Paper text:
Certain bacterial species from genera such as Paracoccus, Pseudomonas, and Alcaligenes have evolved to use DMF as a sole carbon and nitrogen source for growth via degradation by a dimethylformamidase (DMFase). We show that DMFase from [name] strain DMF is a halophilic and thermostable enzyme comprising a multimeric complex of the α2β2 or (α2β2)2 type. The active site consists of a mononuclear iron coordinated by two Tyr side‐chain phenolates and one carboxylate from Glu. The Fe3+ ion in the active site catalyzes the hydrolytic cleavage of the amide bond in DMF.
The mutants [name] and E521A were catalytically inactive. Structures of these mutant enzymes determined by cryoEM show a loss of Fe atoms. In the EM structures of the active site mutants ([name] and E521A), the interface between the large and the small subunit becomes disordered, thus suggesting a role for the small subunit in the substrate entry pathway.
Residue numbers in the entry:
A (entry chain B), E (entry chain D): 8 to 95, 101 to 131
B (entry chain A), C (entry chain C): 1 to 407, 419 to 465, 469 to 761
D (entry chain G): 156 to 310
Write the structure that this text describes.
């Protein structure tokens, strides 16, 4: 008899925890073996006229699909000429940036800090 | 952050001369006044590398000062049954039966069918609270009386719920039974599902008059003031054909109602049949028929999903106009909005001397400045210019109030879409809290991403202000129509003009608009397609409510996918997925059609060997044949980017079409669309597949006509590059100086 | 290299006791005899790392020598009208009208409609040669008289063609006219199409009696011997409502015929309506109705596509059972085959004492060994074992003659599929020469990838012989039924057994099989899903010809996609694409369903925390909790490979499902299937996306039964690894020894 | 005027003829209705002493053949009087359960049919103006209505 | 007007020629600037328990989607215990291979020679 919905949980979440474990280990090893990808991303974060490395694209494919990707929006208003980085009301930051490439590279650094600061 | 403190909208998008538009404005709190005046939008994009913001204020009767006030908005779907006589509040015994399919069974308190007052707890309701179905009566003195089910509800499982009140034994009763078959529910008949109960409790009070309307999928907030009842606790999920009896039922009669048999037909008080009205052209109405013959007719409010799968659905017919007896359910999302129902503040009648162009209304509050864009047509039946510029308003309604933070650069308008969801509504690329995509979108609401001010993603209406500023800076005289007007009129609108330009992203079209384009090009017409992804989704404008749009999607370049039985529209019964699956692909009309999309930056064009053809030397005139067409720009950094169209003879490009150029240097992030994949192998990406490209084409039609397509969104973002001195503006200027002449178009 | 010299096929896949199977054999040339003997198949894969090939000879009443002979195979779709009294050869004037859609108008000479003899040039025909339409008559003495169109045909354009013979002026005529609208042709109304002509020639001879049958989409080869008219010059493309008159038509009559108006309805000699017989059960018949009352009823040969888009199809209806006046075409490919029509060589009645297993007739020619597989059932209504094995014969028909060189390791049975296409046919995974994929397949033809012998994937019959060998190496006693028998008999077949095992790749099911599985598991039933891609496509067995299967695929894990108006099956008027879109996903019945696929190698299973549960202590009975499951095997070197299923509650996985193990180490070549993609974006590959996994699951149903799902193909391939001592075999043996007990399967 | 379902089974493996019979009345098709206590069902059998040989005639529905087919024409003699709904020949001996399922209109064993004449194959929106009786088993044993029986009759 | 179907051709084949030219130049530059992927494919062509490098994976993605991919099969018989390379009746090669991994690496080397010979 299946009679109460609270007796049953979504049992794939155990596999999601295992998967995120292995994937975080692989990404921190990829970063600690090739540290020049941070230099490349500070050079040109959009990949404009220089398409990224396969390892850097692998790092972006890890970052652009986590459930934690939904943080870190770049925020600005019409009369600032400044880019501030929000964190989920959103929690606006302190440092100001004059282009959005600097803000995107700071977001990328802060995501590397997040993936290091969990395991 | 900046706090946006003024909003607004229009009743209708386009307004000709001599006819009147109305403007509906609300503020955060009732104090002070707001200034207002008329402007004329010329450019919107304030990118410092570009021409910047441009406007021109017009003296008119519109300006002045008006008092500001707060205007409450009803938000969420329900069915409202007006009852002034309290006929649906019985004196003695009564029963309520309905079929139930809940998608968020644990999300707060949800009312299913109520004639209830919640200021003073009077009336009756059949609500979901604490995950269980609860049938409560009340009398206004605060003392209620409930009966609560034993078995809770599963998610997305059809139940049959009967609430019985019996004064002869002073007893409430509640029945509950799952009616799953092989096809209608979340899981199937393999489960050992025990979710049936028959409980009861003593009734201490009497169900008194609630002085409200009867609602399906909701409770009532307070007494009906000025004939309007405010729905509060919104249900989320399907409800199939509710009915009220005028007598207490038994377990056997509830068992027979749970098989769909209408027991005791003479003893009904009301019986709303949600499938009464389905003809061979859908159900294009809001009128819910009382199938008991008493005249308690309903009224769908804030657009629930008509034409949805019912409780007895087995997958032998997936079209509701041919099996209407298995399609009597309405979905009732808690976050729909088709109209804000605000009170008017000021109107405006277009004078005779006013040029057809993009306009807006600059509302100026204390520290807040807002725009309301509307359009002005030429006078009816006439034309004032050879060039017509269609403003793609159906695709404006597509991404209206498109929320990413609820789901990347953000301004202060997106944090208002996050902070006040109940005032703004959702987009068709969003998803409901049920997990289902939004089908219905509306113009009569404040659309915040439509304002001209504020790299990676530029909005829709500034992207048409690109073309408007390019036509104003050069010497071109133009009129402006909308896609709603082209739907209303047809190719008779288009045949008054020598050449018809297309906006920046004309993605959502109606069927009749595509018929109008094929009838216009088929006889001596001329057109430019300065965009991409241009006829992808079939869209139908609602017949009763011409400000409400509809789209039901499938597997394509999509945000969501429609549930299995529910592919056919409700405003007409026709199929309406994507235009390519209807043998009406974009290549059959315009020469090119959707091939690939991506999201980082743009590419440049490289001239193909048909550029050096002597038939089309008039296009590539002041361009050296070793150059790069469109490198650098305000959108992406190049001309061919962010969505691409390709030449293809198999989908229906005309056989005389030339292939003048093609875009290159695309990233690995540009994927191939799902419509062209048989087995997905790796390398379906840009730079690794022959489908990721743009294609600049040209073909002549009959009676001296033609068509020119540039197959990229960011073509218009390159017109204002290098202060109007580049290859994009010279090519578009060559073809536009050619198409407005009086000789026929070249072959 | 090796020259395959002997072939053959059965008339039916499975045979019970007391009934006869007939074997139809052919050789390359008529000389000598051939041996034959019955064997029992045990292990098919001749991989030197496995058990090796294993058979067992049976003393039956079959062995001996039979005369080898060559048997000609008719090959190509057409419509044959029996005309013994030569009524369709008028003594005077006549006229022929038909609608035309051509896919390959330049592939040789193609006959459209004809009563023609080709050995001696006699009779009349309407054909395509040099890309033009040619109307030819002949007398029998070699002399002809032709008239030829001026404008050639475009590819895939609807034309109205009227051939006219007129002895009174001694003049042939031919009126060609294109009838494109917005939706029915390859391109639309925007082209200045000039493809109309009206020509004339001189009739110098008289049209004689061809002494053949009237053929649509073909020319008759020679005179009729034994009432059979051989068809040579096959057509490729739709033909819509042909008709023969007994009077010379004019240009006004051709103009009125080209709009769809039947002119002179008493002067008709024959009129074949291809849309006559479309009810709400589709059109499951080959009877072409003469719609003029003369008894000239035709007969479809080699199964052209019934229910295809006609010349007058605007897309307002896409289901052909609700608009049969717009579906009067038949596709007529040149390379179809539903029956070889071969003459019988020998037959075999199944005796009493013959165990239900897999059998084969081993035919020994000179230096070529050949097999013909078939199945033997338990006697009707009896169950001689507690285990049933479902041979997935619908998927054997899916991948039947799956040609790869015509479309990577090859044996000698692939180059003979390539060298002799006319003897073998095509597969549903392949496509025709027109570009449309193959829908109909058939048992009554020599299936050459079904023979049991010969690192990648294996053919589907040795992949089930893996399970047969594992059951014979242990002591288990089993029976064998097929999916045709499950379709015919329902859940009454399944209720005779305790546990039912499923074949290695049961991809294509019927709707009735899904109902049988759901009704069997719902009422105290047990099963093993030892496979993946389990219930993906919908097949319908043809009701007249039970050896003919039908599938009309769509987007998803396909190789071809159905054309826009032609999604609905002709054997029943129902939608029938994939199961998941009909609200019948594979998880809703068998607990897991399709998630990913790929083609390099296999992975291994990593145990999940529900392995250590005590409710499933009976599954993991002899396995240490630090071990891998299936790391090394015959198929890819692992147990989780090539196609993967997953756990998903939203698609309908039952709530009490436990999740035992999951598969890892999948390469970037394993993609996510297109059903799970909203926007495709990079990283949708294996090892980079969560959906790329296998999931070993278990749920318990009511009345003491349940289901075990291994969710991978190579699970059966990794049973014989390391000589039957590995984690896969011990897990399968634990679950199977639990299921064949008399106690209820645990909760 | 009562609808029956009649199955005739020949079995050489047990040298046995068998005959089944079952009334299939509903509320509307027969002479009387469902109120009667109708016991008209049987399942009998006999001994096959001989073998069914070639008759050298055509197959007839509603009739017997007189002599051998001379000049391709067979003379029908003993004429039935009444409706006959969709006869069929199988190539194997049936059982009582399969005759029970045929008596509910379910086509059992579709691959084992030899012939199956569907008297309602050809009914379009303009009646059935023909004499051609379709073999619904796909073998090509097509019929021919002789001397005009009543098409379009209640089944 | 439009009247003869042989006057009009598929004009996308010009772009297929252009794309193939730049694509062959890119792939031979990948092969020349990274000479370890050939030995990587020699050691393990299936990628069994060692997934290929991103540059080797890019070369595999280039080969497996040509219109000229449909040459170089690996023929066998039931009575050989050897592998030969068919070449498009097909015409087989001469050198025998005792395993099919040697046959696959031979096909890979022969495809590198084919992409070098066409420039």
């Amino acid at each position: 008899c299946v009679r109460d919905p609270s007796n049953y949980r979504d049992r794939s979440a155990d596999w999601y925890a295992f998967y995120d474990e292995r994937r975080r280990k692989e990404i921190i090893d990829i970063i600690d073996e090739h540290p020049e990808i941070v230099e490349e991303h500070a050079a040109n974060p959009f990949g404009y006229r220089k398409h990224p490395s396969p390892y850097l694209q692998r790092v972006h494919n890890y970052f652009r699909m986590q459930p934690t990707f939904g943080r870190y929006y770049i925020y600005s208003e019409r009369e600032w000429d400044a880019y501030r980085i929000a964190t989920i009301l959103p929690e606006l930051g302190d440092e100001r940036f004059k282009t959005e490439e600097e803000a995107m590279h700071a977001v990328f650094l802060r995501r590397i800090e997040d993936v290091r600061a969990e395991l | 952050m900046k706090d946006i403190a003024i909003r607004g909208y229009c009743d209708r998008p386009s307004v000709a001369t001599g006819e009147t538009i109305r403007f509906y404005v609300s503020a955060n709190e009732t104090r002070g006044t707001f200034d207002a005046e008329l402007v004329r939008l010329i450019h919107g994009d304030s990118n410092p590398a570009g021409p910047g913001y441009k406007e021109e204020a017009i003296k008119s009767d519109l300006e002045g000062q008006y008092p500001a006030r707060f205007q409450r908005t009803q938000f969420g779907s329900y069915v409202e049954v007006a009852d002034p006589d309290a006929g649906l509040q019985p004196d003695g015994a009564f029963s309520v039966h309905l079929f139930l399919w809940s998608t968020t069974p644990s999300r707060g308190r949800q009312g299913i069918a109520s004639r209830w007052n919640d200021e003073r707890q009077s009336g009756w309701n059949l609500a979901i609270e604490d995950g269980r179905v609860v049938f409560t009566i009340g009398d206004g003195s605060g003392a209620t009386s409930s009966v609560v089910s034993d078995r809770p509800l599963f998610q997305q499982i059809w139940y049959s719920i009967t609430g019985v009140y019996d004064p002869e034994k002073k007893q409430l009763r509640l029945y509950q039974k799952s009616v799953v078959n092989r096809t209608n529910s979340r899981f199937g008949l393999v489960v050992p599902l025990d979710s049936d109960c028959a409980v009861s409790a003593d009734a201490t009070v009497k169900a008194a008059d609630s002085e409200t309307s009867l609602l399906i999928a909701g409770l009532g907030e307070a007494a009906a003031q000025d004939g309007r009842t405010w729905c509060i606790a919104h249900y989320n999920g399907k409800v199939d054909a509710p009915k009220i009896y005028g007598c207490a039922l038994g377990q056997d009669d509830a068992e027979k109602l749970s098989r769909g048999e209408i027991v005791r037909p003479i003893s009904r008080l009301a019986h709303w049949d949600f499938s009464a009205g389905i003809g061979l052209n859908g159900i294009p109405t809001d009128h819910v028929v009382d199938a008991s013959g008493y005249g308690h007719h309903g009224r769908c409010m804030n657009q629930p999903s008509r034409g949805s799968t019912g409780w007895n659905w087995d997958g032998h017919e997936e079209n509701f106009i041919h099996c209407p007896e298995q399609y009597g359910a309405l979905w009732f999302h808690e976050d729909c909005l088709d109209d804000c129902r605000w009170e008017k503040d000021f109107e405006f009648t277009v004078p005779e001397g006013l040029k057809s162009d993009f306009y807006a209304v600059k509302i100026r509050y204390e520290d807040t400045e807002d725009y309301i864009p509307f359009f002005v047509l030429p006078p009816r039946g006439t034309a004032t210019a050879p060039i017509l510029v269609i403003a793609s308003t159906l695709s404006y309604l597509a991404y209206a109030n498109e929320q990413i933070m609820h789901k990347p650069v953000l301004n202060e308008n997106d944090v208002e879409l996050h902070k006040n969801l109940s005032y703004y509504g959702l987009s068709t690329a969003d998803g409901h809290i049920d997990g289902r995509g939004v089908q219905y979108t509306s113009w009569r609401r404040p659309i915040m991403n439509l304002r001209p001010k504020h790299f990676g993603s530029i909005w829709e209406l500034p992207a048409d202000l690109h073309l408007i500023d390019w036509l104003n800076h050069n010497g071109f005289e133009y009129d402006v129509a909308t896609e709603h007007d082209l739907n209303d009129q047809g190719a008779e609108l288009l045949r008054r003009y020598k050449v018809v330009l297309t906006g920046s992203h004309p993605e959502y079209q109606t069927w009749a608009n595509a018929d109008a384009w094929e009838d216009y090009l088929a006889d001596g017409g001329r057109g430019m397609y300065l965009a991409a992804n241009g006829m992808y989704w079939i869209v139908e404008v609602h017949p009763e409510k011409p400000w409400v749009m509809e789209v039901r999607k499938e597997l394509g370049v999509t945000a969501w996918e429609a549930p299995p039985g529910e592919y056919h529209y409700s405003t007409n019964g026709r199929r309406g997925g994507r235009f390519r699956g209807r043998a009406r692909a974009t290549q059959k009309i315009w020469g090119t059609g959707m091939s690939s999309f991506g999201f980082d930056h743009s590419g440049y064009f490289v001239q193909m060997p048909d550029s050096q053809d002597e038939r089309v030397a008039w296009i590539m005139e002041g361009i050296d044949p070793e150059e790069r067409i469109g490198d650098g720009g305000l959108v992406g950094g190049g001309a061919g980017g962010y969505e691409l169209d390709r030449y293809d003879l198999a989908l229906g490009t005309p056989p005389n079409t030339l292939l003048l150029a093609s875009s290159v240097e695309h990233s690995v992030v540009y994927t191939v669309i799902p419509d062209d994949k048989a087995f997905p192998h790796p390398g379906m990406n840009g730079g690794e597949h022959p489908f990721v490209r743009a294609d600049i084409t040209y073909f002549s039609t009959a009676n001296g006509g033609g068509m020119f397509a540039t197959s990229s969104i960011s073509w218009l973002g390159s017109l204002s590059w290098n202060d109007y001195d580049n290859n994009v503006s010279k090519m578009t200027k060559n073809v536009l100086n050619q198409f407005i002449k009086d000789e026929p178009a070249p072959r």
